Design a protein around this motif. Sequence first.
Motif, PDB file in Angstrom:
ATOM      1  N   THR A   1       0.818  -1.207   0.000  1.00  0.00           N
ATOM      2  CA  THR A   1       0.000   0.000   0.000  1.00  0.00           C
ATOM      3  C   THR A   1       0.855   1.261   0.000  1.00  0.00           C
ATOM      4  N   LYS A   2       1.862   1.330   0.866  1.00  0.00           N
ATOM      5  CA  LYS A   2       2.671   2.536   0.979  1.00  0.00           C
ATOM      6  C   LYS A   2       3.830   2.573  -0.005  1.00  0.00           C
ATOM      7  N   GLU A   3       4.037   1.503  -0.774  1.00  0.00           N
ATOM      8  CA  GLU A   3       4.974   1.472  -1.895  1.00  0.00           C
ATOM      9  C   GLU A   3       6.239   2.281  -1.641  1.00  0.00           C
ATOM     10  N   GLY A   4       6.864   2.087  -0.482  1.00  0.00           N
ATOM     11  CA  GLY A   4       8.144   2.717  -0.223  1.00  0.00           C
ATOM     12  C   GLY A   4       8.097   4.205   0.041  1.00  0.00           C
ATOM     13  N   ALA A   5       6.977   4.726   0.535  1.00  0.00           N
ATOM     14  CA  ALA A   5       6.916   6.138   0.885  1.00  0.00           C
ATOM     15  C   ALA A   5       7.982   6.464   1.925  1.00  0.00           C
ATOM     16  N   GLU A   6       8.186   7.762   2.161  1.00  0.00           N
ATOM     17  CA  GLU A   6       9.351   8.194   2.929  1.00  0.00           C
ATOM     18  C   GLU A   6       9.416   7.521   4.293  1.00  0.00           C
ATOM     19  N   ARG A   7       8.330   7.579   5.059  1.00  0.00           N
ATOM     20  CA  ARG A   7       8.326   7.110   6.439  1.00  0.00           C
ATOM     21  C   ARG A   7       7.713   5.728   6.607  1.00  0.00           C
ATOM     22  N   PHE A   8       7.374   5.037   5.519  1.00  0.00           N
ATOM     23  CA  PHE A   8       6.608   3.800   5.619  1.00  0.00           C
ATOM     24  C   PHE A   8       7.215   2.682   4.779  1.00  0.00           C
ATOM     25  N   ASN A   9       8.539   2.567   4.778  1.00  0.00           N
ATOM     26  CA  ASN A   9       9.182   1.398   4.207  1.00  0.00           C
ATOM     27  C   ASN A   9       9.106   0.237   5.195  1.00  0.00           C
ATOM     28  N   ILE A  10       9.425  -0.961   4.711  1.00  0.00           N
ATOM     29  CA  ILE A  10       9.329  -2.177   5.511  1.00  0.00           C
ATOM     30  C   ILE A  10      10.632  -2.952   5.392  1.00  0.00           C
ATOM     31  N   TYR A  11      11.207  -3.385   6.464  1.00  0.00           N
ATOM     32  CA  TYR A  11      12.446  -4.055   6.572  1.00  0.00           C
ATOM     33  C   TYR A  11      12.374  -5.515   6.212  1.00  0.00           C
ATOM     34  N   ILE A  12      11.614  -6.281   6.919  1.00  0.00           N
ATOM     35  CA  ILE A  12      11.476  -7.686   6.852  1.00  0.00           C
ATOM     36  C   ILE A  12      10.581  -8.088   5.712  1.00  0.00           C
TER      37      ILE A  12
ATOM     38  N   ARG B   1      21.058   7.643  17.949  1.00  0.00           N
ATOM     39  CA  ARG B   1      20.824   8.189  16.617  1.00  0.00           C
ATOM     40  C   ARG B   1      20.465   7.088  15.632  1.00  0.00           C
ATOM     41  N   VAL B   2      21.282   6.033  15.575  1.00  0.00           N
ATOM     42  CA  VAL B   2      21.034   4.974  14.603  1.00  0.00           C
ATOM     43  C   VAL B   2      19.713   4.280  14.898  1.00  0.00           C
ATOM     44  N   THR B   3      19.438   3.996  16.173  1.00  0.00           N
ATOM     45  CA  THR B   3      18.198   3.316  16.522  1.00  0.00           C
ATOM     46  C   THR B   3      16.994   4.117  16.050  1.00  0.00           C
ATOM     47  N   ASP B   4      16.951   5.402  16.404  1.00  0.00           N
ATOM     48  CA  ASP B   4      15.823   6.234  16.019  1.00  0.00           C
ATOM     49  C   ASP B   4      15.785   6.503  14.524  1.00  0.00           C
ATOM     50  N   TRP B   5      16.912   6.355  13.826  1.00  0.00           N
ATOM     51  CA  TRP B   5      16.872   6.396  12.370  1.00  0.00           C
ATOM     52  C   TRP B   5      16.193   5.151  11.817  1.00  0.00           C
ATOM     53  N   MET B   6      16.473   3.993  12.414  1.00  0.00           N
ATOM     54  CA  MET B   6      15.797   2.768  12.002  1.00  0.00           C
ATOM     55  C   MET B   6      14.300   2.869  12.249  1.00  0.00           C
ATOM     56  N   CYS B   7      13.917   3.409  13.405  1.00  0.00           N
ATOM     57  CA  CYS B   7      12.507   3.457  13.768  1.00  0.00           C
ATOM     58  C   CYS B   7      11.722   4.378  12.840  1.00  0.00           C
ATOM     59  N   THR B   8      12.309   5.513  12.473  1.00  0.00           N
ATOM     60  CA  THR B   8      11.563   6.618  11.883  1.00  0.00           C
ATOM     61  C   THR B   8      11.142   6.379  10.437  1.00  0.00           C
ATOM     62  N   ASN B   9      11.706   5.391   9.746  1.00  0.00           N
ATOM     63  CA  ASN B   9      11.411   5.192   8.329  1.00  0.00           C
ATOM     64  C   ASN B   9      11.009   3.772   7.957  1.00  0.00           C
ATOM     65  N   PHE B  10      11.189   2.790   8.836  1.00  0.00           N
ATOM     66  CA  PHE B  10      10.728   1.426   8.594  1.00  0.00           C
ATOM     67  C   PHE B  10       9.475   1.188   9.427  1.00  0.00           C
ATOM     68  N   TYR B  11       8.337   1.020   8.755  1.00  0.00           N
ATOM     69  CA  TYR B  11       7.074   0.923   9.477  1.00  0.00           C
ATOM     70  C   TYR B  11       7.059  -0.282  10.405  1.00  0.00           C
ATOM     71  N   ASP B  12       7.546  -1.428   9.932  1.00  0.00           N
ATOM     72  CA  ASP B  12       7.465  -2.643  10.735  1.00  0.00           C
ATOM     73  C   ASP B  12       8.379  -2.573  11.954  1.00  0.00           C
ATOM     74  N   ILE B  13       9.572  -1.994  11.811  1.00  0.00           N
ATOM     75  CA  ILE B  13      10.447  -1.832  12.971  1.00  0.00           C
ATOM     76  C   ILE B  13       9.830  -0.857  13.962  1.00  0.00           C
ATOM     77  N   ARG B  14       9.128   0.157  13.460  1.00  0.00           N
ATOM     78  CA  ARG B  14       8.476   1.110  14.352  1.00  0.00           C
ATOM     79  C   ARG B  14       7.300   0.473  15.081  1.00  0.00           C
ATOM     80  N   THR B  15       6.587  -0.438  14.420  1.00  0.00           N
ATOM     81  CA  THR B  15       5.317  -0.942  14.929  1.00  0.00           C
ATOM     82  C   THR B  15       5.479  -2.202  15.772  1.00  0.00           C
ATOM     83  N   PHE B  16       6.225  -3.189  15.279  1.00  0.00           N
ATOM     84  CA  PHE B  16       6.390  -4.462  15.968  1.00  0.00           C
ATOM     85  C   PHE B  16       7.708  -4.590  16.715  1.00  0.00           C
TER      86      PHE B  16
END
Lengths: 57, 415, 220, 270, 286
Positions: D58-69, D88-103
């Motif tokens: 759905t989000k097709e790689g939008a800025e803040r809604f990419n998916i890692y896994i 810094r690195v942790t919050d960089w991972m969180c801020t743009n990968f939806y699945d890392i942010r959510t789960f």
Amino acid sequence: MDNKITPADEEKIREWLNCEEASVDNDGDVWVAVPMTGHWLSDEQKAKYIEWRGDET
Amino acid sequence: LQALHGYYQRMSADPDAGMPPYLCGQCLITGERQKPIAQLHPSIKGGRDGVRGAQAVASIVSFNNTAFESYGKEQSINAPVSQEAAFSYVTALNYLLNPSNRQKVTIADATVVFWAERSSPAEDIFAGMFDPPRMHDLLVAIRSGKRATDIMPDMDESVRFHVLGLSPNAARLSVRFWEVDTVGHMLDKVGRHYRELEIIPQFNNEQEFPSLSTLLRQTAVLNKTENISPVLAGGLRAMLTGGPYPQSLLPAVLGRIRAEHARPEDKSRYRLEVVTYYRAALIKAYLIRNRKLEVPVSLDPARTDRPYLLGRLFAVLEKAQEDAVPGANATIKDRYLASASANPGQVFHMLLKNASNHTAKLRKDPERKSAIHYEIMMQEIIDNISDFPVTMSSDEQGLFMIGYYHQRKALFTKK
Amino acid sequence: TYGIRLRVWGDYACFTRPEMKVERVSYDVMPPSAARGILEAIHWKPAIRWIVDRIHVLRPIVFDNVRRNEVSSKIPKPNPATAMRDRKPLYFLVDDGSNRQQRAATLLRNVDYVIEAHFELTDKAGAEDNAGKHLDIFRRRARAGQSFQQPCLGCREFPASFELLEGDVPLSCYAGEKRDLGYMLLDIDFERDMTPLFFKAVMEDGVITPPSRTSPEVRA
Amino acid sequence: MTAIANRYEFVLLFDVENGNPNGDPDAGNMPRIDPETGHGLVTDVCLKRKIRNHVALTKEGAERFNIYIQEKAILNETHERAYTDAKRVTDWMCTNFYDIRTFGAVMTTEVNCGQVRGPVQMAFARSVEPVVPQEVSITRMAVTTKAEAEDNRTMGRKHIVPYGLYVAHGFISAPLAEKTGFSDEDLTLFWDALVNMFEHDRSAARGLMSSRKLIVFKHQNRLGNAPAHKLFDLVKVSRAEGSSGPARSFADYAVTVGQAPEGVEVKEML
Amino acid sequence: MTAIANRYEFVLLFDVENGNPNGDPDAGNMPRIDPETGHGLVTDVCLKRKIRNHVALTKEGAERFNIYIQEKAILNETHERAYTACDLKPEPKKLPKKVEDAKRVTDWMCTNFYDIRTFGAVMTTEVNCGQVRGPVQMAFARSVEPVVPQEVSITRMAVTTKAEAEDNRTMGRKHIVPYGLYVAHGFISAPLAEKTGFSDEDLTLFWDALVNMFEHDRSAARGLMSSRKLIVFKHQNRLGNAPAHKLFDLVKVSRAEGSSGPARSFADYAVTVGQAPEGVEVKEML
């Protein structure tokens, strides 16, 4: 050191990956399947393997 | 396991039937503080000469992958056991795995190894007690609720007994179940299991104590040792813990009965049955244990359960069919058993009409009056039922199957 | 009077043994570590340390097997700057060969515990930080059903329902039985480079009392 | 940082018709069923995978809604990064990968163990009442090897659940979100995925799977206002009075939610 | 061949009259049924086979329109075709070591064979041609009312081997459903279509096949089988505007007001299609 993958590694490869299939070609590339989709290990995975071999002997 | 460790300490004492060969942390096996931890545990024997199915180099502890590593620790520091212990347990396991010793049996995909905490004749008995071939007398005794001492006075039942089941995962092997009960207690539990499983034989060549592998094989997708559901193999833990059998067992045997058909490739006179002796035994065990029902060893016509009566009725209709059209390659048991047991209201009308035609043909032919007898049985069975239910539960289907098996056996050569 | 008595129960639980993490095997009873974790899920601050006095095992021990597809590796660290010096896709593909890992589990069913615990102020406690205050806050949260996070029976897949016991503890199935469970995971001493520490779990009458995790004589 | 303000609970009811909702690798790929009760069983990670895939599409790689896994059913055509002592690195991972942010996630290395939790949590989804899978025998035309051509047909097997309604519980902890920036936009997208999980997941095996109901208990406090286990008790999913025998469609089940304590709301997204 | 851009769902209604729509390998040959409720079943595999047959008959092996599963094909010999056309030596049991060549062989398999492009395939066997998921899916067909399969015994007045039984004729039997209305759902995926190459031409051919599915499937055991509706729900974008189940529900299958007793013709059933959501258009005109 003999940084080369050979058929003698196949059991060890199997172990490492835990895959129920392994096959090393004539040059040294390696293959695995069954618990996984059949695929060729990448260069980095080969390096990982070799390190593994060296350390966990 | 530390049980294994203790076993090594036991067998290692004797100069025969064993072997005496020989950072830091708390050894979880022993509990001794500040002992040399193993970085890489010794290997376990796999393959047909060890734990069947696993690769020759098998292991219990294995941290080859980055996922399993924890709290910053590496390849075996995650699982801290002293070197000595590491050796010990492995060795004991291997000795139990050597088939030359009688302490081993293979169930489905898992290999079972057992031992007593000190020398006892149980270790020589349990090898066959859940794979039955004096031993038969002992089995009948414990199935009767008699104490083992009455057949083997040297049986010290206060000795603690252990059973272990190992399943193969390529190089990794997994613990499927584990019991540490006393010899007397678990022997009584096995007795109760065999008591529940008891059913009259279908053909006089079937064994009195059905081997657990044979029971499992009969639920396999093709009646071969492969295709046994490993979870059902593990669930039948229920045999010697005394608890309810896995709830997936009855639907599994019912599924086999649905998807089976009489293969004439056995090349005997009889076409292979659909509700075999062993499937009926499993259904009886499930109904006795999980559902607390009452199930006889043979037919009990003095009964009034509609599922049981419908099973008996199905059996008599099948007998009438096989008498009306002898030697046919198919019978209602091949097709309509699955839907008769699960949905009587939709199918018993057609089965009864077909049985009417069968008795019609039989009446004019010779056997001019077994034509009457089967109709009398239909009368006396149908007489107790008020309606055909729209649907029946899983355990109601189990009772249907048991009734069908009973009424079929009691009618092979009644007339 | 001074202390806590928290009840927890759930359908599933998996307190994995350290020597069987790869192919999960569960401790017959919830280790003090798990207990501590549960307690911290309700209320916790850096100023306070939770201690588990007794663990009651109410429902009988039952085992079950579940197998799941799993990933073999932790995701690698990117560098935020070089991660964008050249725009690139970053992902972890579970279908790319070696990625796929199968991992069995020997997990408990229908658990039911009563955790007796108490608080202890850490050395970095505030001067104004009253232990009675935190006792009251935890009791309020337990009574109201509030929590930092849903406590879990070892693993996140296994949420734990909980209530606070103000009355006398109910009796267990093992009320008149004794059982030595062997050496099991007490805690993890994060001060001493994160090694495990173990205790002899002798269950009696269905209740387990481990030694104090802070004991100098347990610790190295 | 912005974050969701309230603890949420949700009870997701989905159903399958003549399909294998989640196979058992330890039982020949038969659909799982719980040994202690006979209920059908679906692992949470099976559902989390569906949420991940749906959001990836759905989000097709939008800025803040990419998916890692990911899984190898993806496209590489377009991408973009948010690009905002190891925080810094942790919050960089969180801020743009939806699945890392959510789960949540785990990273390879740290002085710490590298754990990221994420607010969302969900449990094994189990059937409302026991299911009894059916074995379906199928046959193929051609043969794969030349050896087995030695007239030529091979017989396979497929396992299906004729029908079953599965209740999936889940918990969203706001305090965990506050450490991960899980905001209300993420939460609305999450409800969207839970409602739409199975839309893109069609395949030969699963048949027809659909999310029939999604009740959401929205709390007032940053923490909760009633115990979650007592909240789940209000969703009395039971059989409609007019139906008897096996359940074969959602109409066979009647589901109602009682009055939740005054401190917590309720919404039926579906 | 440019890919389609729209998400589509479809509902297929088909008849059977004195026929065995799909035999069960287990119950001898009895029509597949749901044993716990009596409703008849047709495996999606059977409908896929009929679609494949339609494709092969109407295109007769034209380029880009071969079919992969055929009555006497050998899969490895077909995969060697892809490896040769890609000039690769067929790697023994394995893929080519170059990922790009692997993609090229898989795409040649997709871009040529219609049914691989459509329904997907699992070709990772011996000579390995990779995997495909298929833009197109369909579920088991299930009757709207329980069917009553009846068993018909027949005789042959000749025998194969040396036999002396004919003293009575050689008996055989047919199983037939007197009548039953089957509702078969289906799904078409744009996202996967793009990854496979499923074009509107293909799609047209697809609806064609569905409408004309059974018209060429006549056999002594099939009876009279026909397609009665093909209610297609076109979504206006790549990702749909409405949940599937929410569209299937618009299609209501009931029994006509004046119809009583067992159904024996399409006229006993009343089919109604509701108003679709504003993001969807319905082409029940098929």
